[PDB]
């Protein structure tokens, strides 16, 4: 069937129940939507994973795609994200590129040859940018409490508080499931002068 | 002698690059055909 072409060739054999449902939606949109019809033909996904966020009603759909299409996805991410939501009520979709990490070497000579975009610091930062893409990070702080813990907080612009407020609980939980790191969010009106906004 | 050896290596590398690109371009022409053969 033609819609299976939207998957990686490995998974065209026995797709999972989530994979082909997304594949049908992508195939149908590639011929109907006005702006998606010239980017989608070159696009195909790797896998789709389901995450259940505790203490919540909505569930999260995570879609993995090859890093080749990073610029392709960024161009149509807004339309693609909203379009998939309608086909899948009661769910939230995030598009994440699949990246690999080289473990930190112990020898000095090897450390000089590491490709910097494959370090865990760089990779985890880009994963976070994928989950909030229309918005961007305007500040970042680390809080070191007396008990010895260290908590990281990320500040977003207050101009787009209305759009992304509902999704922050889901984003924080999924980010922990992929990186095993804790994150917290806040908003800044006038980030130039570092003014945080309370409600 | 050293310069001649280096030049030979350069020529071999360029030939391999061109051959790989040609094979890649020939591939996916079949995939394009299958898209028109649905």
């Amino acid at each position: 069937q033609p819609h299976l072409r939207k998957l990686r060739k490995l998974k065209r054999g026995k797709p999972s129940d989530l994979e082909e449902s997304v594949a049908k939606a992508l195939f149908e949109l590639e011929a109907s939507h006005k702006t998606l019809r010239q980017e989608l033909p070159r696009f195909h996904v790797n896998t789709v994973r389901e995450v259940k966020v505790p203490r919540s009603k909505k569930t999260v759909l995570v879609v993995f795609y090859p890093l080749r299409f990073l610029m392709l996805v960024r161009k149509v991410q807004r339309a693609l994200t909203s379009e998939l939501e309608k086909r899948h009520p009661g769910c939230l979709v995030m598009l994440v590129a699949q990246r690999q990490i080289t473990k930190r070497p112990t020898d000095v000579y090897k450390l000089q040859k590491v490709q910097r975009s494959k370090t865990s610091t760089a990779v985890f930062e880009n994963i976070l940018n994928d989950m909030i893409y229309p918005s961007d990070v305007v500040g970042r702080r680390w809080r070191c409490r007396t008990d010895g813990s260290k908590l990281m907080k990320v500040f977003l612009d207050a101009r787009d508080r209305k759009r992304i407020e509902s999704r922050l609980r889901a984003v924080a939980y999924v980010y922990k499931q992929l990186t095993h790191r804790r994150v917290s969010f806040g908003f800044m009106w006038n980030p130039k002068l570092q003014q945080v906004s309370t409600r | 002698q050293l310069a001649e050896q280096l030049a030979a290596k350069h020529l071999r590398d360029e030939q391999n690059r061109n051959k790989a690109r040609k094979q890649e371009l020939k591939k996916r022409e079949k995939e394009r055909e299958r898209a028109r053969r649905d």
């Binding site: 500040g139 680390w142 007396t146 010895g148 | -």
Partner: protein
């Protein structure tokens, strides 16, 4: 020019404590400086502190309770075997009942009391009491 980031940071903290300030700002930051602060924080000599990111060498804002008397760096970073601990305690510490010497060892950064228990030597970084 500025040759030692650690020496610059510790002198800033000691000066603020002597004048009785409640907070102090530190720049530039470093991973060695952060490790040193956590050692002091664990024994209760400083309060909460916070790291601010600016795509460069960052900055630190630390809250001070009134418990710190002095902190300082040792330059150059002399080597210290396990048998030299009594020598350094005798020279730069007020008493044998309180105060610490901080070392960098192959096991990490730690105070002299913990290093002795682990039976390891290293290089002297500084002190606080």
């Amino acid at each position: 020019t500025m040759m030692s980031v650690l020496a610059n940071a510790l002198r800033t903290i000691a000066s603020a404590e002597r004048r009785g300030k409640r907070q102090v700002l530190i720049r530039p930051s470093s991973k060695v400086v952060v490790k040193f602060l956590q050692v002091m924080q664990k024994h209760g000599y400083i309060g909460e502190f916070e790291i601010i990111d600016d795509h460069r060498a960052g900055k630190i804002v630390v809250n001070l309770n009134g418990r710190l008397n002095k902190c300082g760096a040792i330059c150059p970073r002399f080597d210290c075997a396990t048998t030299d601990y009594e020598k350094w305690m005798k020279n730069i510490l007020p008493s044998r009942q309180f105060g610490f010497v901080v070392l960098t060892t192959s096991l990490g950064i730690m105070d002299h009391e913990e290093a002795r228990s682990r039976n390891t030597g290293g290089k002297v970084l500084g002190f606080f009491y």
